[PDB]
Amino acid sequence: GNIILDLLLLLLTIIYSYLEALVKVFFPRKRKSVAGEIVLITGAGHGIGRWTAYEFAKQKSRLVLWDINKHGVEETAAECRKLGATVHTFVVDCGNREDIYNSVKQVKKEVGDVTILVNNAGTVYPADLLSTKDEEITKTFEINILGHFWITKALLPSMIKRNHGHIVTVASVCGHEGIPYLIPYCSSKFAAVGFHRGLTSELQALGITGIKTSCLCPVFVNTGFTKNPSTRPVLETDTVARSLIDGILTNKKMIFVPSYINIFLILDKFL
Amino acid sequence: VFFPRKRKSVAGEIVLITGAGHGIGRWTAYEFAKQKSRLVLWDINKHGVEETAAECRKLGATVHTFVVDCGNREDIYNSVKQVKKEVGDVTILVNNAGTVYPADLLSTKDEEITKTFEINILGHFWITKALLPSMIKRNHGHIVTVASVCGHEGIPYLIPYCSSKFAAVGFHRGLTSELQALGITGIKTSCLCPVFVNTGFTKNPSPVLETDTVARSLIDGILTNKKMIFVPSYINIFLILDKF
Ligand SMILES: NC(=O)c1ccc[n+]([C@@H]2O[C@H](COP(=O)([O-])OP(=O)(O)OC[C@H]3O[C@@H](n4cnc5c(N)ncnc54)[C@H](O)[C@@H]3O)[C@@H](O)[C@H]2O)c1
Numbered sequence: 001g002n003i004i005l006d007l008l009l010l011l012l013t014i015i016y017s018y019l020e021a022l023v024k025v026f027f028p029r030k031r032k033s034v035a036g037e038i039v040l041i042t043g044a045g046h047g048i049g050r051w052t053a054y055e056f057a058k059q060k061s062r063l064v065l066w067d068i069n070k071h072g073v074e075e076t077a078a079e080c081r082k083l084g085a086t087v088h089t090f091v092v093d094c095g096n097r098e099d100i101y102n103s104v105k106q107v108k109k110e111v112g113d114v115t116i117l118v119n120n121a122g123t124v125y126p127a128d129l130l131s132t133k134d135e136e137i138t139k140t141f142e143i144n145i146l147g148h149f150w151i152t153k154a155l156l157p158s159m160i161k162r163n164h165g166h167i168v169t170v171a172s173v174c175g176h177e178g179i180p181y182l183i184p185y186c187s188s189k190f191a192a193v194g195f196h197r198g199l200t201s202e203l204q205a206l207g208i209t210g211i212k213t214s215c216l217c218p219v220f221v222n223t224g225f226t227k228n229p230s231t232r233p234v235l236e237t238d239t240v241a242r243s244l245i246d247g248i249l250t251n252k253k254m255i256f257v258p259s260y261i262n263i264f265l266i267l268d269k270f271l
Numbered sequence: 272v273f274f275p276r277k278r279k280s281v282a283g284e285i286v287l288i289t290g291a292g293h294g295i296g297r298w299t300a301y302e303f304a305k306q307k308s309r310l311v312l313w314d315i316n317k318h319g320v321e322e323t324a325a326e327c328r329k330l331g332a333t334v335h336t337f338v339v340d341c342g343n344r345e346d347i348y349n350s351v352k353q354v355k356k357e358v359g360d361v362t363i364l365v366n367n368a369g370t371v372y373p374a375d376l377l378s379t380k381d382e383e384i385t386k387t388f389e390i391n392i393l394g395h396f397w398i399t400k401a402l403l404p405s406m407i408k409r410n411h412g413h414i415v416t417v418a419s420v421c422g423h424e425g426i427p428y429l430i431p432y433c434s435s436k437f438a439a440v441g442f443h444r445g446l447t448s449e450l451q452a453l454g455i456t457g458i459k460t461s462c463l464c465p466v467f468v469n470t471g472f473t474k475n476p477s478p479v480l481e482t483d484t485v486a487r488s489l490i491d492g493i494l495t496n497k498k499m500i501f502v503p504s505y506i507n508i509f510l511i512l513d514k515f
């Protein structure tokens with residue numbers, strides 16, 4: 001019975017589909033080049049991080065990959081090398097502040113000064129507020145938003161000198177609206193969306209032009225991060241990476257995946 | 272305006288208010304004392320929270336104070352057991368407490384960022400997590416998350432603060448959706464989102480509201496069970512225009 005009312009939403013998503021693809025062709029945004037840039041990607045051992053390193057390797061960039069999974073990040077670097085990119089990896093606990101700072105100095109003593117940051121890394125512990133463990137909540141924030149500050153903080157001094165960079169904050173639709181069982185996770189993803197919103201307002205207020213900001217906000221991505229989605233599309237690992245590579249190149253502030261989820265958030269502010 | 276929202280009574284309820292030694296917290300305890308509530312105040316400032324309780328007592332309310340570091344998890348849990356061994360089971364929570372360290376991302380201290388999150392959102396999980404089971408049992412409560420317009424859109428110099436306030440607005444939104452998904456009706460949620468309030472929290476504004484005006488907006492939003500208490504109410508249409 002509920003499927004009858006659901007066709008109104010289905011018609012508006014196909015309405016946005018032709019409308020968005022018409023703007024991407026009729027009056028399209030200026031695509032830039034990321035060739036020879038120092039692109040650091042945290043959580044690049046699998047999924048959205050792994051396929052972002054594949055997309056940057058296609059653009060002829062200088063990759064630096066960070067992860068806790070030594071094997072996973074090494075295998076991503078292996079397939080990024082098989083594309084022609086210069087790739088150098090480091091096993092970094094992207095939630096630990098003293099490890100991040102320790103590895104930033106090794107990045108400058110080996111690769112140089114990072115010019116593009118991809119704060120992809122994340123952790124999820126799906127449970128109701130009363131069954132979630134305190135350690136899980138702490139680890140959620142430590143990786144999803146606290147860690148974003150230390151990476152951003154250690155690379156921004158150099159991007160400020162050169163007035164050239166790009167801070168990519170990878171968050172989810174759980175940064176625009178909360179879902180059940182993921183309250184600690186949604187709270188951290190909302191914080192990530194606000195950190196990019198404040199970074200964008202403060203970069204602008206300080207006269208900084210050269211440093212752009214992009215925020216990836218997709219729905220369920222088939223990566224194994226969780227088991228099944230929360231509500232009745234499941235984006236693929238590679239489809240999301242193509243959306244992120246295309247959003248960084250046009251310098252878009254909010255990369256919604258799939259884009260129509262912007263009109264759904266508009267309708268939320270009408271009760 | 273024509274047929275406006277149903278105002279409820281909060282008389283005889285157990286209202287816990289964190290960060291109630293001054294400003295938005297102090298004037299919320301004054302407004303609840305007017306509503307004839309049983310009050311419980313938490314703060315790090317022993318003198319400030321005792322003086323709020325003193326003026327709340329001079330109104331007729333029964334106020335009990337506890338000096339609690341509302342950012343420390345083991346202190347919060349330790350004091351929740353003292354709240355149940357003295358007052359009883361809390362029925363209304365006011366997550367007011369907050370800390371701000373106004374600076375650019377490169378001049379902010381790491382300790383400041385840590386303390387920002389520890390008070391503004393990490394602390395909001397432990398107090399709610401410990402007061403929620405009895406509320407769940409009784410199917411009656413109200414979780415008030417005090418956030419700022421820095422939870423809907425980021426401002427310069429307050430990036431660590433805006434990041435935590437956004438998290439508070441999302442915790443409220445996630446809690447709301449999960450409360451609904453689990454069949455719980457009796458537990459309502461309100462989120463206070465005002466602009467610059469003259470309290471001395473921050474030196475200069477980012478209209479500028481007064482200490483007491485914001486407290487009246489919060490007391491009126493809890494009584495009508497409104498999910499988003501924007502102060503002032505029109506700042507909702509300004510956020511709509513931002514997505515254009
Ligand atoms: N997959 C989804 O359903 C989905 C949807 C929207 C947004 N996202 C966001 O994308 C990110 C990851 O998604 P995914 O599907 O690529 O996940 P994934 O589980 O496939 O891979 C994430 C990677 O992060 C790494 N990582 C985790 N904790 C780390 C830490 N402390 N230090 C360093 N590396 C660490 C893991 O080793 C892993 O390789 C998260 O920030 C998440 O919020 C995911």
Ligand SMILES: NC(=O)c1ccc[n+]([C@@H]2O[C@H](COP(=O)([O-])OP(=O)(O)OC[C@H]3O[C@@H](n4cnc5c(N)ncnc54)[C@H](O)[C@@H]3O)[C@@H](O)[C@H]2O)c1
Binds near residue numbers: 466468
């Ligand atoms: N005042 C504003 O400009 C403004 C605007 C919007 C939202 N807010 C929100 O209101 C809250 C406080 O605003 P205010 O004007 O009432 O502030 P205030 O500085 O006047 O008082 C805040 C109170 O919180 C207490 N507190 C701080 N850290 C604490 C801790 N670790 N444990 C226990 N108590 C602690 C302080 O002792 C103080 O009495 C914050 O959550 C803030 O984000 C304030």
Ligand SMILES: Cn1cc2c(C(=O)O)ccc(NS(=O)(=O)c3ccc(OCC4CCC4)c(Cl)c3)c2n1
Binds near residue numbers: 178219228229264265
């Ligand atoms: C368990 N689990 C983890 C998920 C993650 C993740 O781990 O990041 C992201 C999305 C999920 N669910 S979803 O894809 O079904 C979905 C679709 C649409 C949405 O919102 C649509 C908008 C907001 C109102 C209209 C939203 Cl919030 C969610 C997830 N489910």
